[PDB]
Amino acid sequence: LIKLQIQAGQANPAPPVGPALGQHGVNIMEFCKAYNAATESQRGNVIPVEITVYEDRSFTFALKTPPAAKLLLKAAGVQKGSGEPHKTKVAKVTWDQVREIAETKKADLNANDIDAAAKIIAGTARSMGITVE
Template sequence: MVRPLAQHSKTTLRKAWKHAVSPLHRKKNQLMAPKKKVSALIKLQIEAGKANPAPPLGPALGSHGVNIMDFCKAYNAQTQDKMGQIIPVEITVYEDRSFDFILKTPPAAALLKKAAGVQKGADNPLTTKVGSVTKDQVREIAETKMADLSARDIEAAMKIIEGTARSMGITVTD
């Protein structure tokens, strides 16, 4: 007969939990691979498919001992389908000079400039308006950026994007 969980003693529950079958548990004499120690975290914004060893990329990676050409080849291969966009990247450099990188979504300002059809934002956004975007365009940009924003839902993400648009001198219309 199986007793309800509340009737088991704490010791019994602790033993059951200790011996639970899980991939996270390992045997005593089984060793885990040692973690790599992180040497640096580098954040850059590079045009998709056009990474090369020239500045600013070369000096940023070279100062940490990373093989720049290996990074350029890997980055260009992963961003081929996004040509023409600026893609932020977080590069994690380890002590053994190896690296990993994570691609982010394009900056909201770049997406807004593309949607509004302008080259750059206003010098003084309070008095000068350089373009406009619709609520539907803002929603589309918010859905694209949702993974990188700290918003809990699409409406909150839209408010963040609308604030960015206002600070660039772009008006949001219905």
């Protein structure tokens, strides 16, 4: 079992998932189509797949929620994060957008209410070098 943060609009990226899961014996031809048919709906958000190994070499990709670390990039507008925590800033994010990303991530985080769901992303942003305003 392993979970990687692979882009949505991209297809068949070798460095990230070339030998990661392919070496375990799971095919990639049908996986590419199953990923594209599901990512063409959003076309604007990264989707991390939770690779779940099976005994019969089958594969049922889990359509999890987007990653908070990467959604922070879209919230701040820049793709490259900061270089030092609590020392540099990239941009400001709105509380409404924070609540929206928390609602979308409800199905992945261990939080219970919107408050904690957004506070987890706030702590992630604190560790990465970004604060919410």
